[PDB]
Amino acid sequence: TEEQIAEFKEAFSLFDKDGDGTITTKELGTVMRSLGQNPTEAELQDMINEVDADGNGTIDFPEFLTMMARKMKDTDSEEEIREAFRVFDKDGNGYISAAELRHVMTNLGEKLTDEEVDEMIREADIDGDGQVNYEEFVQMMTAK
């Protein structure tokens, strides 16, 4: 669509997140840090090495067909997210409470904004009980 081609216009030079097709790992990291991401050089490198066509940063951006075209609706995603809830869902049955959600989000891993976590507790499941069904959440990411 319009947004896809518009982003592909920048992607033609920013396959490694830069202005020229190159490895541009450090440039990508600096650009992300300017954007506020502030990534790690090793984190950028591993990622570039994994999904790649040329395998040297200057891939011929087949990720045009990966990012937009892939709806991220892979059943592997649903299974992975279900497993991700499992480690937090002690005894299951939608075990997560919104309190636990905010706790993990704001205290562990990437500490997302408390406002973003509140928006998660609202949009993902408005009920906010200790029995939030996980099928909705995996759909919430995939389809819902």
Binding site: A6, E7, L35, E43, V51, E63, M72, E80, E83
Partner: protein, 332 residues
Amino acid sequence: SAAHKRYRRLQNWVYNVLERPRGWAFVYHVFIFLLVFSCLVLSVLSTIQEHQELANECLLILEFVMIVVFGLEYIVRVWSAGCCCRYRGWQGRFRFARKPFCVIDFIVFVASVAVIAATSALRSMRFLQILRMVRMDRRGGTWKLLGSVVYAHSKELITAWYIGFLVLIFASFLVYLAEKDANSDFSSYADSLWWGTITLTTIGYGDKTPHTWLGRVLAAGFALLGISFFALPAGILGSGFALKVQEQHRQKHFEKRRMPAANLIQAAWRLYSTDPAVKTVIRSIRILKFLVAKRKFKETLRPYDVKDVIEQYSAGHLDMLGRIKSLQTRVD
């Protein structure tokens, strides 16, 4: 700043090598252990009078080495508190020192300075350097594991202790009765208890032995039972150690899953909520985060049959049979 990040890197690295070793980090602790062990050995040598002047000379030099490394150890350790908001600032360093092992480190430091300054007090201070030795295992691990296993297998252990104790009480009595007269080793029941303890543990010094035929028959007969019983706790503890550490490894393995799970859910919700500066940002975050996060999560998910595999199995099967019912009622 480049100097600032060099500061941070060395900060964190020395912190890890001092407080939480792993891999080659153990070489430094091996160095310290050999240092303190050498101090102990050199003290033992200093006891042997026929050659002690050389021991004293080498001991003074070793004490200089100990003093310098321990003081530097303390300073570097306290400074090595710049890896978290936890122990930062002057007040944070104070709380880092309130931690009990840092205390006894300070005491062994001052004990060393007292020894080099300079008989009860001297014996005390040297004993304090031996306190460093016993302080080797900081975070209790050798003690916690032992206590945990002893408590877990309490039944087995009490059985062994009870029966072994009771065999020791009665065998000693009977042998003492048999040999009260002829044998002179068994002058009193206390002696018989000593003999029984040395025998049932299979030490067998041989200073106290039965002599009468009846005594020997009783000793052998009871030996069979006892010998079997006093050796039992070692086997129980060995099995329990293996089992407990296996359990700890499994548990410790599961938290390794905890980080990726948060990674995946943070990335997923943030990226979904977001969905051409902004579009390039979303593109990159989608691609890099998911390709990395899902990957790592997966390599962290599969192993350990025990209960883990069968738990995932049951979960998947439960929704499968749930939908079997659902689809059949939907058809008819």
